[PDB]
Design a protein around this ligand. Structure first.
Ligand code: HEC
Ligand SMILES: [N]
Length: 114
């Protein structure tokens, strides 16, 4: 949860994301503490959208595991809500970051965007 170390990790994330505009992925400023799937202007996959509508909020403790396996995390979330029938299919332009500390750190960095 070292935000400054997270800035470096975020350079990897900038392959697809920016803070303040949509790109391959949605803009991330304000993502921490927000309902999943609700960055203005971005067209989410059914899986990323459906998870937010089922009550997924991007708290730090949700973003950190998500970043290791977006499809698995989202499906697990929906399945535990008894909504496995909304979890069919996969996310867009899927990226996985295995390193746990890098995930923790970049999530602290995301909180600095707003
Ligand atoms: C392109 C290959 C990506 C890289 C590298 C990273 N992300 Fe990403 N992210 C990408 C897309 C296309 C999407 C939307 C997927 C969909 O199916 O709609 C996302 C989504 C996120 C989210 C969820 C945002 C929301 O508003 O619900 C988060 C929190 C996120 N991405 C963060 C993130 C970070 C911190 C990354 C670097 C470690 C990163 N992503 C890389 C595409 C890509
Ligand atoms: N992502």
């Amino acid at each position: 949860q070292d935000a400054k170390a997270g800035e470096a990790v975020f350079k990897q994330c900038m392959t697809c994301h920016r803070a303040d505009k949509n790109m391959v992925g949605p803009a991330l400023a304000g993502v921490v503490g927000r309902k999943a799937g609700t960055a203005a202007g971005f067209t989410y996959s059914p899986l990323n959208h459906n998870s937010g509508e089922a009550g997924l909020v991007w708290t730090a403790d949700n973003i950190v595991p998500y970043l290791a396996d977006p499809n698995a995390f989202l499906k697990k979330f929906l399945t535990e809500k008894g909504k496995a029938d909304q979890a069919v299919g996969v996310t867009k332009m899927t990226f996985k970051l295995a390193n746990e500390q890098q995930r923790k750190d970049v999530v602290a960095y995301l909180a600095t965007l707003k």
